[PDB]
Amino acid sequence: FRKMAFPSGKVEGCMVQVTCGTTTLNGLWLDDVVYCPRHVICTSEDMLNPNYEDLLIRKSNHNFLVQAGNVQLRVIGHSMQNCVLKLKVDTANPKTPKYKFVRIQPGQTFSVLACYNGSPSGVYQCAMRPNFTIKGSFLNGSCGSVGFNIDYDCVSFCYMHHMELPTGVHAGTDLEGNFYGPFVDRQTAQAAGTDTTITVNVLAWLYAAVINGDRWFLNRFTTTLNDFNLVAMKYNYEPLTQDHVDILGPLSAQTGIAVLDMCASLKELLQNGMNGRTILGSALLEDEFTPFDVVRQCS
Amino acid sequence: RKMAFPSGKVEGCMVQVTCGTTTLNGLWLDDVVYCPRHVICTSEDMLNPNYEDLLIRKSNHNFLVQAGNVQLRVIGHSMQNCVLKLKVDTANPKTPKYKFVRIQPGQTFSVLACYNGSPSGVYQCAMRPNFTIKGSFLNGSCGSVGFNIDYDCVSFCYMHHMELPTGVHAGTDLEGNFYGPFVDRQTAQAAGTDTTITVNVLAWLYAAVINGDRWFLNRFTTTLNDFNLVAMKYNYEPLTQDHVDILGPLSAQTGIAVLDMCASLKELLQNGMNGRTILGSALLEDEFTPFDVVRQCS
Numbered sequence: 001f002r003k004m005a006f007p008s009g010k011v012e013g014c015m016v017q018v019t020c021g022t023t024t025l026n027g028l029w030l031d032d033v034v035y036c037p038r039h040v041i042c043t044s045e046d047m048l049n050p051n052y053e054d055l056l057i058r059k060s061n062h063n064f065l066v067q068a069g070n071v072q073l074r075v076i077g078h079s080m081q082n083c084v085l086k087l088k089v090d091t092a093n094p095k096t097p098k099y100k101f102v103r104i105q106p107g108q109t110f111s112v113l114a115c116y117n118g119s120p121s122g123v124y125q126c127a128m129r130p131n132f133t134i135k136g137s138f139l140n141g142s143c144g145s146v147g148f149n150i151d152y153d154c155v156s157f158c159y160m161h162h163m164e165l166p167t168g169v170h171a172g173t174d175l176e177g178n179f180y181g182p183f184v185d186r187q188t189a190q191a192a193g194t195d196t197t198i199t200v201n202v203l204a205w206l207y208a209a210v211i212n213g214d215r216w217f218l219n220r221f222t223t224t225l226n227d228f229n230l231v232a233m234k235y236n237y238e239p240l241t242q243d244h245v246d247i248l249g250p251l252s253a254q255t256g257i258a259v260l261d262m263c264a265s266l267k268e269l270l271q272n273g274m275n276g277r278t279i280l281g282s283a284l285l286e287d288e289f290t291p292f293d294v295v296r297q298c299s
Numbered sequence: 300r301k302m303a304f305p306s307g308k309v310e311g312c313m314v315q316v317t318c319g320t321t322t323l324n325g326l327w328l329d330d331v332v333y334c335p336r337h338v339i340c341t342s343e344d345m346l347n348p349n350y351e352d353l354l355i356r357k358s359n360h361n362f363l364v365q366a367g368n369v370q371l372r373v374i375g376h377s378m379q380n381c382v383l384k385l386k387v388d389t390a391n392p393k394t395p396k397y398k399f400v401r402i403q404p405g406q407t408f409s410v411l412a413c414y415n416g417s418p419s420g421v422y423q424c425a426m427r428p429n430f431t432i433k434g435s436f437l438n439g440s441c442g443s444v445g446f447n448i449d450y451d452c453v454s455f456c457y458m459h460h461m462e463l464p465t466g467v468h469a470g471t472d473l474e475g476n477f478y479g480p481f482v483d484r485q486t487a488q489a490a491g492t493d494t495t496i497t498v499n500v501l502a503w504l505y506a507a508v509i510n511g512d513r514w515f516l517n518r519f520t521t522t523l524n525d526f527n528l529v530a531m532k533y534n535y536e537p538l539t540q541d542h543v544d545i546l547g548p549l550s551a552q553t554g555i556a557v558l559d560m561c562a563s564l565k566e567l568l569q570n571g572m573n574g575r576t577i578l579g580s581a582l583l584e585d586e587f588t589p590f591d592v593v594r595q596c597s
């Protein structure tokens with residue numbers, strides 16, 4: 001199993017750069033609007049303690065340089081929505097894909113198109129951790145890079161990059177400018193909480209192992225969701241939601257193994273360990289492949 | 300993070316190629332579509348195909364090429380080793396600047412996995428020392444390509460043809476020559492014994508340090524030859540002086556001489572990881588080159 005990203009071309013066609021003064025970051029150009037992190041309106045010194053409403057009221061359309069490559073896009077309107085700036089421009093992006101804005105849950109994976117000065121550099125797959133960070137790969141100038149899924153021809157944008165934390169993980173917002181997790185777009189000390197294991201993805205991984213003929217760990221028992229959740233938390237595993245049970249449905253049907261039976265097999269792995277064995281070649285349980293990732297790759 | 304090149308320039312070149320009941324992908328550059336020649340085989344032909352004999356019996360109209368909703372008219376065809384070349388009556392306006400390159404084992408490249416001419420995923424792979432690649436390919440993925448991007452230029456280095464019994468993959472360069480001792484015939488084929496790409500493991504250890512993890516370092520050094528004696532014992536590739544030189548920038552950045560890092564890797568090989576992990580991995584990772592690490596860590 002590879003970390004496998006979505007093809008990035010539909011998103012590459014939407015990347016621009018946005019500059020205010022000497023502060024340059026990336027923006028997303030969809031129809032006649034450009035979306036970008038609002039901290040572009042900050043001097044580096046403003047970032048220590050910004051008042052965004054006051055900083056913005058002093059700005060006009062003509063203070064915003066938006067460029068697709070070297071080509072200027074004239075800004076004709078601006079507004080702030082939570083931590084994102086929306087810049088209306090006088091040109092509709094001819095490469096706009098079918099798209100939507102979605103807010104994802106922890107455990108969901110998405111592709112990130114890392115960009116610098118509006119120019120794509122790389123694409124990779126990330127999982128939103130339960131502590132609402134991602135283990136990204138971002139350097140200076142990467143803010144406004146976006147994360148996305150593609151379902152058919154529709155691009156679902158779920159992430160816009162804002163921050164690198166002390167442990168080296170990353171934080172950002174949805175495309176409505178609402179941060180994932182407790183973070184704020186201020187240059188003040190912040191830290192990720194203690195992370196936990198994404199149970200629904202581990203279960204997806206066990207289903208993947210069964211699909212591939214690796215099933216020593218299937219035990220004879222079952223459990224209730226509540227009992228499993230109370231046990232899992234003792235191992236620093238996330239509790240399951242009803243939505244988690246539901247998105248495991250197709251893998252449960254494919255294998256004939258009820259979700260709660262798989263939960264009992266995982267409970268025994270937690271309480272007794274691997275005892276020297278492996279699953280899909282690994283003594284470690286993988287938690288960054290969703291049920292959909294498992295189907296995408298076994299498909 | 301294992302990082303692939305943005306795939307858009309390549310997505311604009313993928314098409315679907317059908318011959319008979321066989322469908323796979325092609326690469327449409329200027330007025331030529333490149334795809335695996337085994338598209339021309341039946342089930343019975345694949346057992347032992349005399350490709351020159353099978354191809355001469357085909358006409359342009361036996362090839363259905365579809366770019367999205369448009370059929371491209373094939374107006375000629377030739378064969379170059381294991382790749383079929385279909386000339387079409389239309390230039391692909393999305394053709395990027397490009398070159399065809401043959402890569403060396405240990406080098407990395409991005410794969411755009413495609414089915415029925417449609418892109419499905421993008422990931423990073425390395426050419427293994429035994430000339431396989433550990434990809435993720437299913438039925439219908441043949442003709443998917445591997446590439447690198449420098450400036451605006453796409454360097455194509457791989458076209459996908461087959462999966463081996465062990466689950467690894469084999470294919471050709473864009474001149475149709477296989478990597479490795481494989482043949483585009485429907486027979487079980489084993490690869491040679493694989494080895495671990497040592498210069499890449501060392502690049503990855505430097506990456507682990509750059510990101511603050513140094514539990515595996517030690518106070519010792521080693522000579523190049525004594526390291527290579529141990530490496531070969533553990534089925535690691537030998538490290539060459541050019542490898543040492545390529546690791547220069549990472550050595551400078553961390554203040555850790557290459558032969559010092561070799562001494563740390565020697566200890567890991569002889570002692571294992573003792574339950575610990577490096578950059579989240581329980582195994583030593585060998586599919587990042589020095590260049591890959593440098594680009595992403597600077």
Ligand SMILES: *[C@@H](O)[C@H](C[C@@H]1CCNC1=O)NC(=O)[C@H](CC(C)C)NC(=O)OCC(C)(C)Sc1nc2ccccc2[nH]1
Nearest residue numbers: 039047138139140143162163164165166185186187188190
């Ligand atoms: C994009 O503008 C940029 C992307 C960063 C740059 C390096 N890698 C990235 O992902 N973001 C910022 O510079 C961002 C801007 C603020 C207005 C949100 N600042 C940021 O990430 O600051 C980090 C904090 C100060 C919020 S917390 C922190 N991070 C570290 C890292 C190392 C030591 C200590 C530390 N404390």
